[model samples]
Target: MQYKLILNGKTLKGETTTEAVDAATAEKVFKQYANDNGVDGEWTYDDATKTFTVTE
Candidate 1:
């Protein structure tokens, strides 16, 4: 099975007053990950890598 995980932090965090949260705004500092894993709890974004890490 081909799994797909999408966390549009650009839309998720920017939903309420998180306006202007640009992954393309901050030079893509705020991004996400795509995979076959869906274990949501706590997530961390390390700009150095430019990807969202599931730190949970």
Candidate 2:
């Protein structure tokens, strides 16, 4: 499945297996990616929309 992540007003695109939908699982994946991409910001989950958002 495809997911959209927002960081510092920039939108980042991501994809993951169906099994990674859980908050914990998704956060782990998102965190790793943000770090790898040198992102420094606060991360949050929009429970209603199931998207991750980060702010610098």
Candidate 3:
């Protein structure tokens, strides 16, 4: 499982696992990431595949 921040269809933060993770977590993290890097958008998550996609 990965809390992924997809840029150019690529993963930046790498892979990990968390049972209670959600879209807001992704948003919160992604904002911190891209916020420093200057960005905003939404994310897609798949529990089965364990993929978090940032569609900016």
User: On residues 15-52, what C-alpha lDDT tens digit does candidate 3 reach at each position?
Assistant: 33334356566556655666565444565666576555
What digit string (tens of lDDT, one per residue) describes model 1 on residues 21-49? 44344422223222223333354544454
User: In candidate 2, what are the lDDT values of residues 1-56, reduced to their tens digit?
Assistant: 33556656346544432235466776776678777876758877765776777676
What lDDT does model 1 reach? Answer: 0.33
As a whole number from 0 to 100, the lDDT of residue 41 in candidate 2 is 80
Would you list the clashing residue pairs of candidate 3?
Answer: none
TM-score of 2: 0.64
Per-model lDDT: 0.33, 0.63, 0.52
Candidate 2 residue spans exceeding 4 A from truth? 1-3, 9-19
Per-model TM against the reference: 0.29, 0.64, 0.43
Ranking by lDDT: 2, 3, 1
Q: How many angstroms is residue 35 displaced in model 1 relative to the true structure, after the best TM-score fit? A: 13
